[PDB]
Amino acid sequence: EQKERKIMKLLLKIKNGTPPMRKAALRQITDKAREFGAGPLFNQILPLLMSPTLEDQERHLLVKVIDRILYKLDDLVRPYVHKILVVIEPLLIDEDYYARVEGREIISNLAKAAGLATMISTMRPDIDNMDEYVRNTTARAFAVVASALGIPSLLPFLKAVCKSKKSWQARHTGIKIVQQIAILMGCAILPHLRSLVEIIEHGLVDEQQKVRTISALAIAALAEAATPYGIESFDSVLKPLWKGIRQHRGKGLAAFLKAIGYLIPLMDAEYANYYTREVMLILIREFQSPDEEMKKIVLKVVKQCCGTDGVEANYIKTEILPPFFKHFWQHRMALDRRNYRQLVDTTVELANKVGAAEIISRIVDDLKDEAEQYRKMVMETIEKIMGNLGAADIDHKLEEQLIDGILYAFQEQTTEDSVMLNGFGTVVNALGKRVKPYLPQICGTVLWRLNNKSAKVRQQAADLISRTAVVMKTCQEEKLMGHLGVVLYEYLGEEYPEVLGSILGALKAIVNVIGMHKMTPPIKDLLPRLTPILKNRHEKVQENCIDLVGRIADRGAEYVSAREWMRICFELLELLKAHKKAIRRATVNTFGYIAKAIGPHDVLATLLNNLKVQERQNRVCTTVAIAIVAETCSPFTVLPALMNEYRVPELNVQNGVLKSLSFLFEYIGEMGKDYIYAVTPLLEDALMDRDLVHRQTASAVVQHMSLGVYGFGCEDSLNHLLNYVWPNVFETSPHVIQAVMGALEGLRVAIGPCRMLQYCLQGLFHPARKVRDVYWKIYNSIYIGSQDALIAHYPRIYNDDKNTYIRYELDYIL
């Protein structure tokens, strides 16, 4: 009895505590599994698996137990299969993907453990069950049984089941299993495909509507899994499907149409023609069908047939499009999101084959429609088609209808819709140069919506400017872009940051277009307005404001004072280390522009004075800033100033220039090659110095110099620096020794493993353990780093009495 309590203790140490406790306890259960026995152990495990309280990760760990005990127990599980299975089976039907895959995993392991004959003998009485739910799970159980074991192994059982004359429920479940096998396995079906089709094939012909339905769904699932291969396997079922298509009705026909839709993409171009035409006689009739399930199918079959290579673009243009537009492109279809997405997709695929203009010309008449949701549907379709195919196909007379309708739809939607914003931006960007005649109408429509009283509605108008200002450049740009910008300049006082971010995102788009002299709110008025906005808490505002101040610095440096730029740099300074990636990247780019704007000298003098007087947070920000002023502008303008700060006889400023140099070398990368010789003597002083933090961060400079200059020569200067790094190998402070290991791992790359080995050899067998520990730690980094390179560099070691240590193959001559 007490050993069952040990199972509790072991379960507890898996379900709770540190990972080695879990690992040990699992090892204990699994090796003890033979003694515990399957009966007691599953009487105890299955209650946890049945508990509603069990988390996903608890369940996953319990599965990681179940796999191993099943492997250990093996044949011992055979009496308990029935009990184990009924607790597990519901997982196969759980909506949670992970609960589901876990159930499949443990049925797989249970099926490897228990003999096939026992799985069959367990689940066979459920094949014949009256409940479709029991049959459904049983079908999913057997599919997993098939997956774990060989598919051929289960075939002789399926061959008996699908011909089980005494119960349609049984024959039905057989074909459910054959469907579920295809859904589970995927393309792995293919070498067993004809064996599976030849099990189903008689079912399509059967006297029971249920069996015909499930066999058509099995054939759909097999065809889906086989795509694009395996057509030769289905040659059996082609005749039965047409003979059914011509005859069946309702959801029993929807099943056959589903099968056919998956078969036509498998076919050669000649058969694709013949059999698509066979479909349309019935599929066009089903376009009238009231049933939403049928309507889901026929759109799928249209998408599949017209997507197939064989079927003529002209055939689609003549026989598909007229009845399709008639029955589906009408107001009633916008009402259901399922039909909505399916119709949009189907229609975009027709466009991919037949062309943009053939579809768009049947749709655009309804951009001017009454209903918002139907206008949304057509707009989403035009959005997708012109995103895929562009404007090339579209007639001038179709532009006129597009743009008229697009403008009408935008002025019509009561509430800001993303779809209308997408559609309008896409179509304008696609048309490009062709938009020129309509620009007054577009601008007026935008400007109207930009003067609207609603926050969201103005956000959408500014977003639309943001997405399309590049097209608006075309002509009278100064006139139109400029007034849009003056309206936006008023909204720079926005109460809502969501909106202000878009105002800024629209202003940003204007200055990326306008020549800065032609700006309508002059830059002298624009920048002061932005300076308080830089301090806004909201991410979208900060991003667009910093990025906009960026373009003003880049493109229009001359319009504002040195001191104006200097104050802006000093405010931007902390944003270089902001939490958000976007805010940092904007700050880095734009500090780089403003450093060019000011010129490097006084911005650097200001940064070096800040580096002496601030808290660690803002001091690290200045090290980032100084490096931007080096990569941008000139590095040679930065290093002379840093060299002078190091001549100040104070440990805190000196330590500061070492952090500045360490980041400068990380940041400028390959540019560092020009500068190693100049910075070398500073690093000698720093690395000879008594201070622990000088030697730590001089080592960090050497890491970044080394990794930055790899392959550009300079190994002379790096060998020289290694003579000052290397003595620090016996330092004991965590921070200095990790920085020294970092430097050595850098120099292994830039000087190479040969040199690093030459520094290790005399210490690997040195008398003192504290030398050996340190030298083997270094050697192991070089070895893991460069194992195959070391072959060339190992010294000649002479033979002993017992042992051969020469490498004779490398002594050979040719």
Partner: peptide
């Protein structure tokens, strides 16, 4: 002011075309 004049023209111009 063109802004509302052209707005009213757009909406009426469709419902005349309808």
């Amino acid at each position: 002011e063109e802004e509302m004049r052209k707005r009213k023209e757009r909406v009426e111009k469709w419902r005349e075309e309808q």
